[PDB]
Amino acid sequence: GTFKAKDLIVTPATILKEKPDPNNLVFGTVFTDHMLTVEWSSEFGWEKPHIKPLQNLSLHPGSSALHYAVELFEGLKAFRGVDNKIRLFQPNLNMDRMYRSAVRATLPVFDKEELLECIQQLVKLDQEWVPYSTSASLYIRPTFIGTEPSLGVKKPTKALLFVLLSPVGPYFSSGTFNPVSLWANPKYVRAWKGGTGDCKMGGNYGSSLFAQCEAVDNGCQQVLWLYGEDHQITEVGTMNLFLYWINEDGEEELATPPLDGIILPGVTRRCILDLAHQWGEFKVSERYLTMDDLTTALEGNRVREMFGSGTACVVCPVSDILYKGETIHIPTMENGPKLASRILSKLTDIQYGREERDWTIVLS
Amino acid sequence: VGTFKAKDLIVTPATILKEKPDPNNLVFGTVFTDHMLTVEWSSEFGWEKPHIKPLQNLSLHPGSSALHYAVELFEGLKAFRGVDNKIRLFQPNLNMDRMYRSAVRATLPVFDKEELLECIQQLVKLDQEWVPYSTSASLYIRPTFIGTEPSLGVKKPTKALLFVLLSPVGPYFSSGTFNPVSLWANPKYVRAWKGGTGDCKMGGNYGSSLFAQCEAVDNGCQQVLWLYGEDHQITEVGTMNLFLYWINEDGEEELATPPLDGIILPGVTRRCILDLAHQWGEFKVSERYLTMDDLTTALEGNRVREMFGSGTACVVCPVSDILYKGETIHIPTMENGPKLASRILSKLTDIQYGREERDWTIVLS
Ligand SMILES: COc1cc(C#N)c(Oc2ccccc2C)cc1-n1c(=O)cc(C(F)(F)F)[nH]c1=O
Ligand SMILES: COc1cc(C#N)c(Oc2ccccc2C)cc1-n1c(=O)cc(C(F)(F)F)[nH]c1=O
Ligand SMILES: *Cc1c(COP(=O)(O)O)cnc(C)c1O
Ligand SMILES: *Cc1c(COP(=O)(O)O)cnc(C)c1O
Numbered sequence A: 001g002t003f004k005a006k007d008l009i010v011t012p013a014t015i016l017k018e019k020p021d022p023n024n025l026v027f028g029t030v031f032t033d034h035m036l037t038v039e040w041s042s043e044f045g046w047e048k049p050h051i052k053p054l055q056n057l058s059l060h061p062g063s064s065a066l067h068y069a070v071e072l073f074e075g076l077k078a079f080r081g082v083d084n085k086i087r088l089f090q091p092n093l094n095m096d097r098m099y100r101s102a103v104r105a106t107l108p109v110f111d112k113e114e115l116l117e118c119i120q121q122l123v124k125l126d127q128e129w130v131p132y133s134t135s136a137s138l139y140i141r142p143t144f145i146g147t148e149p150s151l152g153v154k155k156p157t158k159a160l161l162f163v164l165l166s167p168v169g170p171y172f173s174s175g176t177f178n179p180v181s182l183w184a185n186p187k188y189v190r191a192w193k194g195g196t197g198d199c200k201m202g203g204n205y206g207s208s209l210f211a212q213c214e215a216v217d218n219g220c221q222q223v224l225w226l227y228g229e230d231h232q233i234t235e236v237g238t239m240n241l242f243l244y245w246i247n248e249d250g251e252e253e254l255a256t257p258p259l260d261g262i263i264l265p266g267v268t269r270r271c272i273l274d275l276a277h278q279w280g281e282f283k284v285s286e287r288y289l290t291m292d293d294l295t296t297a298l299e300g301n302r303v304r305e306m307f308g309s310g311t312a313c314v315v316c317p318v319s320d321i322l323y324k325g326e327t328i329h330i331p332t333m334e335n336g337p338k339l340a341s342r343i344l345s346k347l348t349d350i351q352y353g354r355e356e357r358d359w360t361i362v363l364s
Numbered sequence B: 001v002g003t004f005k006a007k008d009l010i011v012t013p014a015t016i017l018k019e020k021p022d023p024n025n026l027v028f029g030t031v032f033t034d035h036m037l038t039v040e041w042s043s044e045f046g047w048e049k050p051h052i053k054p055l056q057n058l059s060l061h062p063g064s065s066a067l068h069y070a071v072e073l074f075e076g077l078k079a080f081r082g083v084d085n086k087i088r089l090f091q092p093n094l095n096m097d098r099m100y101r102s103a104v105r106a107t108l109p110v111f112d113k114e115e116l117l118e119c120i121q122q123l124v125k126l127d128q129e130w131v132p133y134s135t136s137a138s139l140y141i142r143p144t145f146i147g148t149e150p151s152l153g154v155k156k157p158t159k160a161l162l163f164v165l166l167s168p169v170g171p172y173f174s175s176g177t178f179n180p181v182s183l184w185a186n187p188k189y190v191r192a193w194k195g196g197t198g199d200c201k202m203g204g205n206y207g208s209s210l211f212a213q214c215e216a217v218d219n220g221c222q223q224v225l226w227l228y229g230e231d232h233q234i235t236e237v238g239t240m241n242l243f244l245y246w247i248n249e250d251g252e253e254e255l256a257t258p259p260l261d262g263i264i265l266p267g268v269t270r271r272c273i274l275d276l277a278h279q280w281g282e283f284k285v286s287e288r289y290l291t292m293d294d295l296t297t298a299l300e301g302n303r304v305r306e307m308f309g310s311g312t313a314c315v316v317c318p319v320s321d322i323l324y325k326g327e328t329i330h331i332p333t334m335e336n337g338p339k340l341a342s343r344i345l346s347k348l349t350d351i352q353y354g355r356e357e358r359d360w361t362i363v364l365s
C-alpha cells in the first residue's frame, strides 16, 4: 500500500506563533505551526497522512532510529517570488533521491507524487512562514525514521515519515558574500566507495561532527572532506565543491568531483553544470581534484574562484583552506567573484521567479 | 565538565509489573523489563540527577539531532544468572570505556564511567527477576546516548539524553548449540573506512548494513562477511569479530584476527579471546590482515582448521561457508571439532555463569 494526499486529516493549530525576524535567523532553530506525519506498520501498511500542530514525537526508546541510525532526510526550499507566487525548486529530484535512500535504508516505499502533494498542502497551510525577502526561504525537512521497538538489527516493521518547515534567512547576514574558511584534515573521511555518501542518510552526518568541531577550533566554518592517498577534495562540508581555474592544459575550466558514489549528487550541483554547459564560455569537467592540483595551481596564479553549492548556501565562496598547519589563501573574492556572482544571480532569478524555468513549480 | 552521581538516583518503581517471558521462547531485543534509567544533559546546566522509572516512550522534539544526523551511540553487555543463582556482569568496565570513547567521537558530553556502571547495577538489581532462570539465556543491557538538540543545524548538540534498556534474550540459536553460519561476501558494500567511526558503537555504522543483510538472507546466508579494499580483506562477520585458526604461510599454527586499524570494532569478546590465546601460549596469535586469496590459498592446502565470529550476540559462532564471486567456498570448521571454538565457548560460558571465578565478572550489588 501507499498513503494518499486525498486522505489528508488536517488538525489546524488554535494558537499561531509570532513569525521570526527575516534577517535575525539562526539556521534550523525556528519551526512553523504545522508538521506532516504518516505512520507505517508491516501489519497494516500506511495510515492516513496528518497535518497537525508541531509537537514532540512519542517514540519507544528501542526505536531503531536512535540505535542503528535507521533514518534519512531531504532538504528542499520554497521561495516567495517577486510576483509573490511561492515556488518549489526541482522538488521531484528531492522526492526521487528520498525514495532511493528509503530503499537503501530498507524503510518502506511510498508514492512520490502523494508525498510531494502532502508537502504542498503543509507549505500552503503555513505559507506566511515563506519569508517576505529576496534572500530568505522556507526550508522543508522531510524525515523518515524506523520506530521498530526492537534492538534486533533488522528491516523495521514500524516507521514514521514526517515533514518540518523552518524559515531560513540569508546564509550570511550581509546577504552579499561572507567567504568561508575550510579545515582540511585527511585523518577524517565523510564517505567511501561502497558506502552511502550519495544518499542523505543520518549516519553520513553523525561521524562528521567531530571534524566540524575541530574545524571551528582552528577558526574555520566548514570541513574540506579529503579522500584517498592523493588527498582528493570531495565536498565543502554539506555542499558540493566547485573550482574555477586555468587547468593543467592552460584552459579556463569549471571543475567539480565526479558522482562516483562518495559525492552527494546535489540539486544545486547538477543545475550549475547545466548552466555552465549552456553558457559554453569555458570547459566544464566532472574530474578528480587533489590538494596538490590546487597548491600547484595556486603557485601558478591559475586559481580564480572556489565555492560550495547546496540547498543551505546556493553559492558559498571559499577564501582559505587550513592544511598541514599552514593557511592556504584562495583568491575567490579578489576575482569578483565573477562566476560565483553570475551563478547566484541566475539561480536566484529562477528561485524567486524573476524568469520562468522548468526547474520551478508554483505551489498548488 | 562534570557527571551525574549514582548517590543522587531518584527511583520511581512501577505499580504494575509485566509478566516475565518463557526463558526457552525469547525473541532477541523484543521483550523489555519494567524499569529504564534516564539522565538529561544540557550545555547550560550539565547533567541532571539520574532516574530509574517505569519503561516509557521518549518525548523528543522532531528536530532532535538523533533523528536527522545520527547523533547517537549505544553499548551491549549482558547480566548472567549463574549456576549459584548470583547475577554477574562480564567485563562491564570495558563496555563503559568503549562507550566513553564513542561519546567523545560523537561530540556528546563525557560522564563518569564508575557512576554509569553503578546506576546500571541499581537498574539491573531492581529488575533482577528479569535475568532469566536459564544457563543459555541472559539479560541484554542497552546503554544508549542521543542528541536531543531541537535544531537542524549540523553541530555539537547542547541537549542530550542517556538512557538504559534491559531485555531478556535466549540463546543465540534455538538448539543452544553450534549452528554454523553461511556468509555473504560482496565487495560492493563496505561497513567502515580509514578515518571513519567503525571502531565505535555509533548508530551510523549499522544503518547502511541492513540492505546487505537482506541481500545475504536472499542468497541463503545468515550474515554478511564485510570486505575492505582492493585485496578484499575479511574484516567482520556481521556485527561480530572474525577469527581464523590455521597453518599460516610460514607453516605455523596461528590464531589470526584483523588488526585495530580503525575499520574493526574492538569487541569485548575479541579482547577476551586474544587474552586467552596469549595466556595459553600453545600457538601463534596474530592481529594481521587476512584476504579472501590468503583464505582460498590456505583452503587449497588444507591449512584452515576453524573460522568463527565472536560478539556479545554469539560468544563463538562457527563459519561453515562463504559465498564469493558466485561460488560457495567451504570452511572445514565443523570437520575440525571445532576444537578451539568449543574450548573458547566452554571458558567464556563457565566464567559468565560463575562455574569458575575470574577478574572478568562482577556480582550484582
Ligand atoms: C546555515 O547553515 C546550514 C544551512 C542549511 C540549509 N538549508 C544546511 O542544510 C543541510 C544540508 C545538508 C545536511 C544537513 C543540513 C541542515 C546546513 C547548514 N550548515 C549546518 O547545518 C552546519 C554547518 C557546519 F558548519 F557546522 F558544519 N554548516 C552549514 O552550512
Ligand atoms: C540475536 O541476534 C543478535 C543478538 C545480539 C546481542 N546481544 C546482537 O548484538 C548486537 C551487536 C551489534 C549491534 C547491535 C546488536 C543488537 C546482534 C544480534 N544480531 C542481530 O540483531 C541481527 C543479525 C542479522 F545479521 F542476522 F540480521 N545478527 C545478529 O547477530
Ligand atoms: C545536502 C547536501 C549537499 C547539497 O545537495 P543539494 O540537493 O544541492 O542541497 C551536498 N553535500 C552533502 C554532503 C549534503 O548533505
Ligand atoms: C558489538 C560489535 C561487535 C562485537 O563486540 P562485543 O563488545 O564483543 O559485543 C563486533 N563488531 C561490531 C561491528 C559490533 O558492533
Ligand SMILES: [Mg+2]
Pocket (backbone or CB within 6 Å): A111, A113
Ligand atoms: Mg499513484
